[PDB]
Design a protein around this motif. Structure first.
Motif, mmCIF file in Angstrom:
data_model
loop_
_atom_site.group_PDB
_atom_site.id
_atom_site.type_symbol
_atom_site.label_atom_id
_atom_site.label_comp_id
_atom_site.label_asym_id
_atom_site.label_seq_id
_atom_site.Cartn_x
_atom_site.Cartn_y
_atom_site.Cartn_z
ATOM 1 N N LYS A 151 0.835 -1.194 0.000
ATOM 2 C CA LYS A 151 0.000 0.000 0.000
ATOM 3 C C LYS A 151 0.872 1.247 0.000
ATOM 4 O O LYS A 151 1.882 1.313 0.702
ATOM 5 N N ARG A 152 0.479 2.233 -0.795
ATOM 6 C CA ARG A 152 1.219 3.482 -0.880
ATOM 7 C C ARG A 152 0.229 4.613 -1.108
ATOM 8 O O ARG A 152 -0.914 4.373 -1.502
ATOM 9 N N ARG A 153 0.661 5.843 -0.850
ATOM 10 C CA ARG A 153 -0.208 6.993 -1.052
ATOM 11 C C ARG A 153 -0.603 7.031 -2.521
ATOM 12 O O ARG A 153 0.135 6.550 -3.383
ATOM 13 N N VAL A 154 -1.768 7.597 -2.803
ATOM 14 C CA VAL A 154 -2.246 7.681 -4.172
ATOM 15 C C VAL A 154 -2.775 9.071 -4.488
ATOM 16 O O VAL A 154 -3.388 9.719 -3.645
ATOM 17 N N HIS A 155 -2.509 9.529 -5.703
ATOM 18 C CA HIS A 155 -3.009 10.816 -6.160
ATOM 19 C C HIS A 155 -3.629 10.503 -7.514
ATOM 20 O O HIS A 155 -2.921 10.289 -8.495
ATOM 21 N N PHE A 156 -4.957 10.465 -7.557
ATOM 22 C CA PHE A 156 -5.666 10.125 -8.784
ATOM 23 C C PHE A 156 -6.801 11.079 -9.140
ATOM 24 O O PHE A 156 -7.562 11.511 -8.273
ATOM 25 N N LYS A 157 -6.912 11.396 -10.425
ATOM 26 C CA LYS A 157 -7.973 12.267 -10.911
ATOM 27 C C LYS A 157 -8.821 11.488 -11.913
ATOM 28 O O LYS A 157 -8.303 10.966 -12.900
ATOM 29 N N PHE A 158 -10.122 11.399 -11.651
ATOM 30 C CA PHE A 158 -11.031 10.693 -12.548
ATOM 31 C C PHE A 158 -11.196 11.473 -13.854
ATOM 32 O O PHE A 158 -11.300 12.699 -13.838
ATOM 33 N N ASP A 159 -11.214 10.762 -14.980
ATOM 34 C CA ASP A 159 -11.380 11.398 -16.287
ATOM 35 C C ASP A 159 -12.819 11.868 -16.464
ATOM 36 O O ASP A 159 -13.113 12.722 -17.304
ATOM 37 N N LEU A 160 -13.710 11.289 -15.668
ATOM 38 C CA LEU A 160 -15.130 11.613 -15.703
ATOM 39 C C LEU A 160 -15.698 11.326 -14.315
ATOM 40 O O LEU A 160 -15.127 10.534 -13.562
ATOM 41 N N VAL A 161 -16.810 11.970 -13.973
ATOM 42 C CA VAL A 161 -17.411 11.767 -12.658
ATOM 43 C C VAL A 161 -18.160 10.440 -12.601
ATOM 44 O O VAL A 161 -19.115 10.216 -13.349
ATOM 45 N N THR A 162 -17.712 9.556 -11.716
ATOM 46 C CA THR A 162 -18.332 8.249 -11.555
ATOM 47 C C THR A 162 -18.662 7.986 -10.093
ATOM 48 O O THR A 162 -17.803 8.082 -9.217
ATOM 49 N N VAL A 163 -19.921 7.651 -9.840
ATOM 50 C CA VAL A 163 -20.389 7.386 -8.492
ATOM 51 C C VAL A 163 -19.689 6.201 -7.841
ATOM 52 O O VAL A 163 -18.987 6.375 -6.846
ATOM 53 N N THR A 164 -19.870 5.000 -8.384
ATOM 54 C CA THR A 164 -19.235 3.836 -7.772
ATOM 55 C C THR A 164 -17.721 3.835 -7.943
ATOM 56 O O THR A 164 -17.011 3.178 -7.185
ATOM 57 N N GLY A 165 -17.231 4.565 -8.940
ATOM 58 C CA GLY A 165 -15.794 4.644 -9.138
ATOM 59 C C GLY A 165 -15.209 5.393 -7.955
ATOM 60 O O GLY A 165 -14.184 5.009 -7.387
ATOM 61 N N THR A 166 -15.873 6.480 -7.581
ATOM 62 C CA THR A 166 -15.444 7.278 -6.442
ATOM 63 C C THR A 166 -15.525 6.436 -5.166
ATOM 64 O O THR A 166 -14.614 6.450 -4.336
ATOM 65 N N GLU A 167 -16.617 5.695 -5.017
ATOM 66 C CA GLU A 167 -16.809 4.868 -3.829
ATOM 67 C C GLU A 167 -15.771 3.752 -3.724
ATOM 68 O O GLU A 167 -15.235 3.493 -2.646
ATOM 69 N N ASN A 168 -15.481 3.094 -4.840
ATOM 70 C CA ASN A 168 -14.500 2.016 -4.828
ATOM 71 C C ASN A 168 -13.142 2.567 -4.395
ATOM 72 O O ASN A 168 -12.427 1.941 -3.610
ATOM 73 N N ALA A 169 -12.793 3.747 -4.903
ATOM 74 C CA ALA A 169 -11.517 4.371 -4.562
ATOM 75 C C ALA A 169 -11.465 4.734 -3.079
ATOM 76 O O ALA A 169 -10.473 4.471 -2.402
ATOM 77 N N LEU A 170 -12.536 5.340 -2.579
ATOM 78 C CA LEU A 170 -12.604 5.729 -1.173
ATOM 79 C C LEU A 170 -12.507 4.504 -0.261
ATOM 80 O O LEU A 170 -11.828 4.533 0.762
#
Ligand SMILES: C=C(O[C@H]1[C@H](O)[C@@H](CO)O[C@H](OP(=O)(O)OP(=O)(O)OC[C@H]2O[C@@H](n3ccc(=O)[nH]c3=O)[C@H](O)[C@@H]2O)[C@@H]1NC(C)=O)C(=O)O
Length: 416
Positions: A151-170
């Motif tokens: 596990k390491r820190r992550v800095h990611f920007k979604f190319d588009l707004v995604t509900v479950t994509g955001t949730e999976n990442a969180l």
């Protein structure tokens, strides 16, 4: 099953109705339990097929749980990290198990979703995030194999707004003992509800604009939580009141999760009066056309699009309804046309030329949320409307026909 509804139109909806917990808040929150070994309690969880399938998956993963009185009692004794294809084909949102499983075991094998009637709906953003997180991702045998060396820190920007994509990442980042950042995230109320739960478990989450700053933990705690009310169900009944020219009082809903919906409803001729926490809804002016464009929250929900199309099918004038979220989501438009509507579809935009009345006939449900539009239309269509394959509606609404019946709708369910 082939259960169906028989709706004999011509009754205004009147009375009180209690709104259920949000299906799409309960789902990610339940998957969050995988992140801890400690017992969790989730209340105000609706009893509908998607929730039941999620509980089945958790049991398959090793968890011990009970679902009683809209409350989930779970002992997250997860001992497996394989989410089978069958479950994924039954509910693509099962992909939400990926983030938690990876955070708990550093490995996961999740079936890749197939196409959906709502659209192809690929999950490239989910997979892209995990690759950016440093995980090895490979697709084999129709499964996504994810392996994390560390596990390491992550800095990611979604190319588009995604509900479950955001949730999976969180869900995943909540398990990483470092400071990470997500940009261009979804702000849907359900995402915010999941966030509170992750914080209750011990993670730190700060939301500013569409950025999320996360500080996870490897020793997440158990939690007790009451999920937010379902804004889509609430909006659906609001439309029902205006369409049938009735008067209903919604209990246990949240006006602050319905701004865009109330706005359009008033433009069409409806009215919404807040009484303490309750929402009294009725038709104030004759129905009139209005343009609508779906957008990510706080904009107009794609999950409310079909319902408003049914309302607008009998409004005065031509309305333009454009989809910016699920551009293919218009199956209901032609089913409404089977009821005498005059709707045209050109690309991602539908045009509704209001008609004086609808004529009941047989229509088919195909969308767990959008198909509620068919039930709504059936409430005002002349004669009787038969809504086939309500199995879809059973996935998205809790006791829909029962709540409508309580409001005076002459509806009945035929078990088949
Ligand atoms: C349809 C449901 O509700 C849906 C709701 O309609 C949508 C939009 O608000 O957001 C959730 O799905 P979702 O997370 O897959 O929707 P999104 O991810 O934001 O997809 C929005 C658009 O982005 C596209 N998209 C999304 C992710 C991705 O990796 N790639 C991609 O191209 C999709 O094809 C879609 O056209 C809800 N589902 C759950 C479990 O939260 C349902 O109850 O099953």
């Amino acid at each position: 099953y082939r259960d169906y509804f028989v709706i004999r139109g011509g009754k205004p909806l009147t009375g009180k109705v209690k709104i259920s917990g949000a299906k799409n808040a309960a789902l990610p929150i339940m998957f969050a339990t995988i992140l801890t070994e400690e017992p969790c309690t989730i209340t105000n969880v609706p009893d509908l097929l998607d929730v039941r399938n999620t509980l089945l998956l958790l049991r398959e993963l090793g968890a011990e749980l009970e679902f009683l009185n809209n409350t989930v009692f779970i002992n997250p004794s997860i001992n497996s990290f394989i989410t089978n294809q069958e479950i994924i084909r039954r509910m693509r949102a099962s992909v939400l198990s990926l983030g938690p499983l990876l955070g708990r075991f550093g490995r996961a094998v999740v079936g890749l979703p197939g196409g959906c009637s709502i659209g192809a709906r690929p999950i490239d953003q989910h997979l892209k995030f995990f690759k950016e997180a440093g995980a090895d991702v490979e697709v084999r045998e129709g499964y996504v194999y994810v392996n994390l060396k560390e596990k390491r820190r992550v800095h990611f920007k979604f190319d588009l707004v995604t509900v479950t994509g955001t949730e999976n990442a969180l869900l995943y980042l909540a398990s990483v003992p470092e400071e990470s950042i997500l940009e261009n995230i979804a702000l849907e109320p359900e995402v915010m509800d999941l966030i509170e739960v992750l914080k209750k478990m011990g993670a730190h989450v700060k939301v500013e604009g569409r950025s999320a700053y996360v500080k996870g933990s490897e020793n997440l705690k158990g939690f007790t939580h009451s999920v937010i009310p379902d804004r889509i169900e609430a909006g659906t009944f609001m439309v029902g009141a205006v369409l049938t020219d009735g008067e209903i009082l919604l209990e246990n809903a949240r006006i602050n999760h319905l701004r865009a919906v109330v706005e359009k409803l008033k433009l069409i001729g409806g009215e919404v009066v807040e009484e303490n926490g309750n929402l009294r809804v009725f038709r104030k002016e004759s129905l009139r056309a209005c343009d609508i464009e779906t957008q990510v929250y706080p904009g107009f929900p794609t999950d409310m699009q079909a319902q408003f199309m049914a309302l607008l099918s009998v409004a005065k004038g031509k309305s333009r309804i454009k989809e910016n979220i699920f551009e293919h989501r218009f199956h209901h438009a032609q089913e409404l046309n089977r009821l005498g509507a005059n709707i045209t579809v050109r690309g991602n935009t539908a045009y509704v030329e209001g008609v004086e009345r609808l004529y009941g006939s047989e229509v088919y449900s195909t969308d767990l949320r959008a198909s509620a539009s068919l039930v709504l239309a059936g409430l005002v269509a002349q004669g009787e409307t038969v809504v086939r394959d309500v199995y879809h509606l059973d996935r998205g609404y809790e006791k829909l026909e029962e709540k409508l019946k309580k409001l005076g709708a002459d509806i009945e369910r035929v078990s088949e």
